[PDB]
């Protein structure tokens, strides 16, 4: 099932990177254009960024400009971040595993 | 902020791959050992797999064997899946972006 799981993870990463896009943009808009930060916040109450293609589709009806920036920002975030994710996540898995195996072997040898 | 975002994404991927581990294991246990599938389900009600190092720490107090299998299965899942994630997620971002840009350019040129 490494196909079913790869696919589901990629969809999850795609949507998560989109949330990170909207988090970053909203942070800039806090200083740069506060009334749009606020708007972005309320629209996100009314639309679960979880279902991200629908969110963006919902947003084009009201703010095409913000939709475009999320598209752009998330493409850059992906392009920036994705290359280190393999090495990072695997390394964190090997060391979380390491900790947990060191801890329970400690309990097993009381 | 590509560091703050890479770090947060890796933590999220780590935890998500752990949930996928527990999803897969629970699926096997459905057929292989049903009474442990059920137990795994109830423990997951009482412990948010979201905070995954704590979950696994909570589980060692009650089922060290299952904790070890999650450790193993999630390391394999990571090792299996992580190499295609860059190419996959970026490709899905380029084509989701493509769709949304094709759709709103359609509205802008009514």
UniProtKB/Swiss-Prot annotation, chains A, B:
* Chain coiled-coil ranges: none
Effect in UniProt of substituting residue 73 to A: Assembles about 50% RbcL8
Annotated consequence of substituting residue 19 to A/L: Assembles about 50% RbcL8
Q: Which cystines does this chain contain? A: none
| GO MF annotation terms | protein folding chaperone; protein homodimerization activity
Annotated keywords: Bacterial microcompartment, Carbon dioxide fixation, Carboxysome, Chaperone, Cytoplasm, Photosynthesis
Per UniProt, subunit arrangement is: Homodimer (RbcX2). Interacts with the exposed C-terminal peptide of RbcL ('Glu-459-Asp-468'); binds 2 RbcL peptides per RbcX2, stapling them into an RbcL2 dimer. A slightly longer peptide binds with a higher affinity, but no long-term stable interaction with RbcL is detected. Contacts a second RbcL monomer via its peripheral polar surface.
Protein name per the record: RuBisCO chaperone RbcX
Full-protein positions shown: 2 to 111 of 134
């Amino acid at each position: 099932e490494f196909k079913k799981v790869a696919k589901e993870t990629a969809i999850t990463l795609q949507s998560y990177l989109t949330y990170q896009a909207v988090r970053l943009i909203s942070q800039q808009l806090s200083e740069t254009n506060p009334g749009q930060a606020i708007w972005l916040g309320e629209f996100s109450k009314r639309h679960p960024i979880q279902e991200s293609d629908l969110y963006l589709e919902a947003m084009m009806l009201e703010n095409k400009e913000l939709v475009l920036r999320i598209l752009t920002v998330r493409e850059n975030l992906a392009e920036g971040v994705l290359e280190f994710l393999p090495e990072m996540v695997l390394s964190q898995i090997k060391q979380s595993n390491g900790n947990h195996r060191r801890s329970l072997l400690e309990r097993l040898t009381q």
